[PDB]
Design a binder for this molecule. Structure first.
Ligand code: PLC
Ligand code: PLC
Ligand code: PLC
Ligand code: PLC
Ligand code: PLC
Ligand code: CL
Ligand code: CL
Ligand code: CL
Ligand code: CL
Ligand code: CL
Ligand code: NA
Ligand code: NA
Ligand code: NA
Ligand code: NA
Ligand code: NA
Ligand code: NA
Lengths: 311, 311, 311, 311, 311
C-alpha cells in the first residue's frame, strides 16, 4: 500500500478528532496523565471509490491491512499509544472514516507557581510525517472533538477540551511534519489542602506564639522547638507530593517564610531569658509585649505581600 | 467477516453476562479495582444455521477468526481487557454462545464522605458501537451474571453483583452506542480502624486532658504539644491511604476538629500559667476546674453533631 | 481440532502434576505469591494411536497446534499464566504427555490471627471446562507432583506441596467444571520480629515504668509520653507490613493492649502529682509502690491470657 | 535477506542519527533516564539500485521485511528499545534511508560528588555486530543528530546533545563490533535544594547555638537534642533521594560535619553545667563566651575548606 | 523440526557462553538482580551440512524457525528471559553458532550475616531437558564467557564471572536435565554506611552518655529518651533496606545491643535520682563515676566480641 495520489499537487488533508472517554492518574511529580479516548481520522482515497447502484452498498468496510492508513503519532507520549481499530468505513467518493480507541501516558509540563490554587493546560500533540509521494497535513473536525460527561480527573476540575485548528507545519529530518495541539484545561481542587496542610500548619505556628505570654524559658524552648519540628514534617510532606522546581511555588514560599518566624521567635525567647538572668525583666517585658503584636501583624502583612506577588 | 443481516430492520441483540472469578486490589487513592471474570456473549447469526438431523451434530465449534463476533468493550477500564476465548458454540438455529475469561483494571469513583464506615457501588460498563450495516444493542442474560463463592476483596464485604437490565442507548460520533451497567455493591470492613487509628487517636487526646489536673506549666506544655505531634502523625497516616477529596470525609472532620481541641487546650494551659505568675491562682483554678468538664462534654456533643451530619 | 471422542459416554480424564521450580514474592498486604513451575498434562487420544513396528518409533513428538490440548486454567491467578510448552509426546496407544513451564501470580488468602507466629496453606487451583462433545475431569499423577530442593520462600519455611487427589466437580454456566486443589504448606520465620519489633517495644514500655521510682512529674511526663510516641511508631511500622483484617491479630492485640498500659501509667503519674500538690505525698507513695508491682504483674497475666486466646 | 556485498573489501558504513523527542524520568537512585527519539539509519545497498528515468519514481518505499536492515542495538539499555519503523526510502543509487521512532530506559552512571550542584554527561551507546559476509561500521550523520526545543528533563537543564564521531571498533566473541557514543550534557537545577533542605538545615543548627546564651542546662539539652533529631530527619530525607556511593558527596560531607557540631555543642553544654554544679560559673562563662564566636567561625572556615575540596 | 540424530549413542553437547553487557538493580529485599547479556550456543547438526562451492557461501545464515534450536532455559528467573536472536551461523560440517542478547531478573539468595561488609556469589543457572530421540548435555565454551569492562553494579564491586565447567546432570519427571552454574562474585561497597548510619548511630549513643556527668534527672531523662528515639529511627531505616532473616546480621546485632545500653543507662539515671531523693548522693556519685568508665569499656569489649563472632 502507498499514499493516495494527488489529482493536481495538493496536500493530503487528514481530518482528526479526539473524544475523551477517561482521564486519570495526573501525577504532579512525573508531570504525566493517562488518557483513554477515541481517535477519529478522515481522508479521501480515490482508488477506493465505488458506484452505489452496481455495488448495492452505500458504505464499504475494510480491515486496516487492506487499505492505506496515515501513520499518525502522538508527540508527547512515554510509549506509543495502545490502539484498537473500532471501524473503517468508505463512502462512494472514497472518503475514509477511521475510528480507533486508544490509551496513552502523556508528558505535559505543569506550572506549580500558584500551587495548590493552580490551573493547567494539558497538551496532546498529534503528528503526521510527509512522504516522498506527497505532503500530509492535519486538520481538526470540530464535530469529532469532545469528552464524555463522566470524564473525571481525581483532584481536578475539567474546564474545556479544545483543539488549535491551525496545524504547526515544519521540517524534521528532511520531511515535513504536521502537528496539531489538543488542549485540556483543568483547575486544581484546592479544598483538601485547607484542613490537611494549611490550617494544621497555621495552628502549630499560633501555638508557638503562646511563648509571648510566658516567662518560663524551658517551656518556651519546648513550645517553639516542638512546633518547628511539626512544621518540618509538613514541609517534607508537601515536597514529597511535588517535583523539584527552578522557581518558588506559593506553598513553598509560605512554608519557607514560616521558618523565619520560628527563627525570630527563638531569638525573642533567648533575648527574653538572657535579660531575666541579667536582672533586666522590665526590658524583656517590653520586647515580649511588642512581640505579641509584631508577630501576628508581620505574619499577616508578609502573607498579603506574598499573595500579591503570586496572584 | 461482516455482521449478521437483519430479517426486517431490527437491531442485533447481544446477550451478555459477567461471572466474577476474582476481585482484588481495590485502591482507594487510585479509585480502581482489578477483576478476573467470565464474559459471556450470545446473538443469532442465521448464516451459521444448520440441520441437526443430517449433520448428526447438535452443536458446532468455531474459532474466533472463522466467524463474526461483536466488538464489545469496557468503558471504565485503564487499558483494554486481557482476554482469552474459552469457547464458541453454535446451535442449529444459528444462536452463537461466546465465552471468554478476562482480567481488567476498572476505574470507578468512590464516595469517601462516610470513611471508614462507607459503602460503595462499583461499576463495570459494557459497551458496543453500532456498525453501518446494523444497530447493535446489549441485553443482560441474568442466568449468566454472578460471582464465585471464594470471591474476596481484602478489607471489604461483597454484598451483591447485579446488572441494570435496560441498556443506555445513545449516539456517539454519528453512531449508536449500547451501554450496560454491571454493579458490584461493597461495604468497608471498618473493624481494624478502631484499634489502629480511632482508639490510639482518642487515647492521646485524653492524655492531653490530664493537663487540667496539673499546675505545672512546663509539664502541661509537654503533655499538649507531644500528643499534638502524635495527632499530626495519625493525620498524615490517614491522608496517605486516601485521595484528595473536594469534600470533608467523616474521619477528616474528626481529625480536623481534634486540632481545635489541642489549640484551645494550649490557650487554657497559657491562661492558667499567666494568672499564676500574676498572683491570681484562685481564678486560674476556676478556669481549670471548668475545663475538666467542658473539654470532654464539648468533645462528646461535637461528635454527636458530626455523626448526625454524616450518617 | 476437536476433543477425543468417547468410546462409550465416559468423561475424559486429564492427569495433572505441578513441579515447583521457584517460589518468591509472598506479599502479605496483597495476599499473593509468585510461582515458577512445570505443569504436566496427560490424557488418552485414540485418534493419535500408532503401531511401533510399522512406524519404526516408540514415541511421537507433536507441536501444540498439530493436536488437541485441554484448555487448562488456574482459578486464583491475577492474569493468565505465562507459559512455554517444553514437550508433547505420544505413546503407541495414544497416551499424550504434555509439559509446560509457567510463571504466575497467585491470589491466596492468608490467616493473620497468629502473626508473626503463623502458618499458611497456599492454594493453586487447576481448572478445566467441559465441551459440548465431552465432559473433562482432572486427576492428580502423584509421580508428577513435587518441588525442587532449592525452592526457598524468603521469610518462610516450606513444609509440604501436595494435591487433594479428588477434584471438586461442579456446574458453572451449564457446563461441568473440574477443579483440583494444589496445597503449599508454609510457616513464617518469626525470628527477626523478636530483635526488630517485639524486644524494642518491650524495652520502651519497661522504660515508661521507671516513672514509678520517680516523684518528678516533669520527668515522668517526659518518660511516659516519649515512650508512647515510640510505641505509636512501632504500631505504624507493623500495620504497614499487614493488610487491614476484620479480626484482631496476635501482634495487633499486644500492640493495642500496650496503649492501655500507657494510658493507665499517665493516670498514675497525674494522680501522684495531684496528691503531692494537695500535700498528701504519703498517699501518693502508696499508689506508686503498688504500681511498681501491679504494672509488670498485670502485664504478664494479660499476656498469658492473650497467648491462651490466640494459641 | 543477506547483507549488501562489498565492491572490493570495504566495511559497510551505517550512518546514524538520534533526534530526541522526549527526555523524562532521570532517576538518581537507579542511575537511569527514559528517552523517546528518532533513530535514523543510512547505508548503500547496490542490489536495490534502480533507473530514475526508466522507473519514473525518484524514491522507492520498502517494508522492513522486504529488505536487509542492519541489526542496530543500544548497549546501555535495561530492555531492548520499543521501536516503530516510520519510513524506509531508497534512492536510485541504492542509498537506503531508514527511520524509526523508539523509546528506551537508559542506564548511565552519575557522578554525585558535587550534588546538588552537579553536572552530568549521559551516554546512549549505539552498537552493531559484523557478519561473516562483511564488517559493519557505524558513523554519525551530524545533520541527523539533535533534539526538539520542547525537550525538558524535570529538575535539570539540558546543555547539549552531541555524538563522538569516531566509533569504538573492537573484537568481541570473534567478530567485530562498532560502538558510537551519543552524549547528553545536563546540569542540575539546584534552586529548590536551597529553601527545602539547605536553609532549613542551617536554621536548626543556628537554633542549637542559642544554647551559648543560656545557663539553663535543661533548656540547653532540649535545644541541642531536638535540633539534632531534626538534622537526622534531613539526613534521612537526603539519603532516600540518592544511591549509596563509594565516595562522599558535597551534601553528604556537610550533613556529616554538622553532626560533629552537634556533638561538640553537647560537650560544651555538659562542661558548662558540670562547672556550675562544682561552683565554678566564672569559668563556665569563659567557655560559653568563647563558644559564641568559635562555633560560627569554625563552621564558616570548615565550609570554605569543604567547598574548596569539592569545587 | 526434530533434534540432530546420533552417529553412535552419545548425547548431544550444547556448548554455552554468557557475556555480561549490563548488571543492575541488585535488590537486597527481593534477593534479585537484573542482567543484560549475550547467550551463545553451539551444537553440530549434520542435517545442515553443505558445500561452499555449490551454495556459493562459506557460512549459512538461518532464521530461528528454519532450524532446530535446543530449548535452553534459566532455572532461577522470575519470568522467561526477553531474548533477541543476533545471529544463527551454520558452517559446512553442520556446526551451528547461535547468538542471542537477553535480559532477565534473576533470583539468587543473599547471605546477610556480615552486612554491610558482605560478599556474595550470584548464580545464573542454565538448563536443558533431554528429549525422547536423545539426551542433551550442556558444556561451557570458556572462550565465550566474560563481561564488558563497563559492567557496574551500583553499590557493589564485581570480582569475577566464571562458570563451573561440569554440568549437574540429573533426572527430573522421567527425563534427564543438564544444569550449568554461572557465578558472579561481588563484594558490597560498605563506604556509605559509615557516614550515613554507623557514625550517626554512635554519636547519638555517646550523647546519651553525657548523662553520666549530670545530676539533673529531668535533663538526663531527656538525653537518654531522645537519643533512644533517634536510635529507633535508624533501626527502622536499616530494616527497611533488608529482608527478614532467620538469623542475626552484623548490623542487626549492633543495633539490638545498643538498645541494651539505652536500657541500662535509663536504670542508672533512675537509680541515681532515687538515691539523691533518699539523701544518699555520695553513693549515687560512686555509681555515676563507675558508669563513665563501664559504659564505653563494655561497649568496646561487646563490639570486639561481636566482630569476632561475625568475622
Ligand atoms: C497560610 C496563608 C493562608 C492561605 C491564603 C489563601 C490563598 C489565596 O490567596 O488563594 C486565592 C485563590 C483564588 O485564585 P484564582 O482566582 O484561581 O487566581 C487567578 C486570579 N488572577 C488572574 C486575578 C491573578 O483561592 C481561593 O479561592 C481562596 C480560598 C483559600 C482560603 C484559605 C483560608 C485558610
Ligand atoms: C471519635 C468518634 C468515634 C467514632 C464513632 C463511630 C462512628 C459512627 O457513628 O459509625 C456508625 C457506623 C454504622 O453506619 P451505617 O449503619 O452503615 O450507616 C448507614 C445508615 N443510615 C442510612 C441510616 C444513615 O458504624 C458502626 O457500626 C459504629 C461502630 C464503631 C464504634 C467506634 C467506637 C470508637
Ligand atoms: C509481648 C509478649 C511476648 C511474645 C510472646 C511469644 C508469642 C508466643 O506465644 O509464641 C508461641 C509460638 C508457638 O506456636 P506453634 O506451636 O507453631 O502454634 C501451634 C500451637 N497449637 C496447635 C498448640 C495451638 O512460637 C514460639 O516458638 C515463640 C518464641 C518467641 C518468644 C518471644 C520472645 C520475646
Ligand atoms: C552549608 C553551606 C551552604 C552551601 C554553599 C553553596 C555551595 C557551593 O559552593 O556551590 C557552588 C555552585 C557553583 O558551581 P559551578 O560554577 O557550576 O561549578 C563548576 C566550577 N569549577 C569547574 C570551576 C569548579 O553553586 C552556586 O551557584 C552557589 C549558589 C548556592 C547558594 C547556597 C546558599 C545557602
Ligand atoms: C559499631 C561497630 C563498628 C563497626 C566496625 C567495622 C566492622 C568490621 O569489623 O568490618 C570489617 C570489614 C573487613 O571485612 P573482610 O576482610 O571483608 O571480611 C572477611 C574476613 N575473614 C575471611 C578473615 C573472616 O570492613 C573494613 O574493611 C573495616 C572498615 C570499617 C570501619 C568502621 C569505623 C566505624
Ligand atoms: Cl502514538
Ligand atoms: Cl475492554
Ligand atoms: Cl491460567
Ligand atoms: Cl536496543
Ligand atoms: Cl529463560
Ligand atoms: Na495500511
Ligand atoms: Na470475528
Ligand atoms: Na490444540
Ligand atoms: Na530485514
Ligand atoms: Na522537656
Ligand atoms: Na527453532
Amino acid at each position: 500500500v502507498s499514499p493516495p495520489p494527488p489529482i493536481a499537487d495538493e496536500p493530503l488533508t487528514v481530518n482528526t478528532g479526539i473524544y475523551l472517554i477517561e482521564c486519570y492518574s495526573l501525577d504532579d511529580k512525573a508531570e504525566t496523565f493517562k488518557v483513554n479516548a477515541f481517535l477519529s481520522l478522515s481522508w479521501k482515497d480515490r482508488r477506493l471509490a465505488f458506484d452505489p447502484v452496481r455495488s448495492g452498498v452505500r458504505v464499504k468496510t475494510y480491515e486496516p491491512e487492506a487499505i492505506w492508513i496515515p501513520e499518525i503519532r502522538f508527540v508527547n507520549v512515554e510509549n506509543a499509544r495502545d490502539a484498537d481499530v473500532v471501524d473503517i468505513s468508505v463512502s462512494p467518493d472514497g472518503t475514509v472514516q477511521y475510528l480507533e480507541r486508544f490509551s496513552a501516558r502523556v508528558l505535559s509540563p505543569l506550572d506549580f507557581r500558584r500551587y495548590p490554587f493552580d490551573s493547567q493546560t494539558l497538551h496532546i500533540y498529534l503528528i503526521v510525517r510527509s512522504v516522498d509521494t506527497r505532503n500530509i497535513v492535519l486538520a481538526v473536525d470540530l464535530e469529532k472533538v469532545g469528552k464524555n460527561d463522566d470524564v473525571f480527573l481525581t483532584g481536578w476540575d475539567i474546564e474545556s477540551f479544545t483543539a488549535v485548528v491551525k496545524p504547526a507545519n515544519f521540517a524534521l529530518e528532511d520531511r515535513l511534519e504536521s502537528k496539531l495541539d489538543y488542549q485540556l484545561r483543568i483547575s486544581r481542587q484546592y479544598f483538601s489542602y485547607i484542613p490537611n496542610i494549611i490550617l494544621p500548619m497555621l495552628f502549630i505556628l499560633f501555638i508557638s506564639w503562646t511563648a509571648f505570654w510566658s516567662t518560663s524559658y524551658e517551656a518556651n524552648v519546648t513550645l517553639v522547638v516542638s512546633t518547628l519540628i511539626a512544621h518540618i514534617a509538613f514541609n517534607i510532606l508537601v515536597e514529597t507530593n511535588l517535583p523539584k522546581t527552578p522557581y518558588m511555588t506559593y506553598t513553598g514560599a509560605i512554608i519557607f517564610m514560616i521558618y523565619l518566624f520560628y527563627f525570630v521567635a527563638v531569638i525573642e525567647v533567648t533575648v527574653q531569658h538572657y535579660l531575666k538572668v541579667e536582672s533586666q525583666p522590665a526590658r524583656a517585658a517590653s520586647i515580649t509585649r511588642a512581640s505579641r503584636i509584631a508577630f501576628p501583624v508581620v505574619f499577616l502583612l508578609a502573607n498579603i505581600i506574598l499573595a500579591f506577588l503570586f496572584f
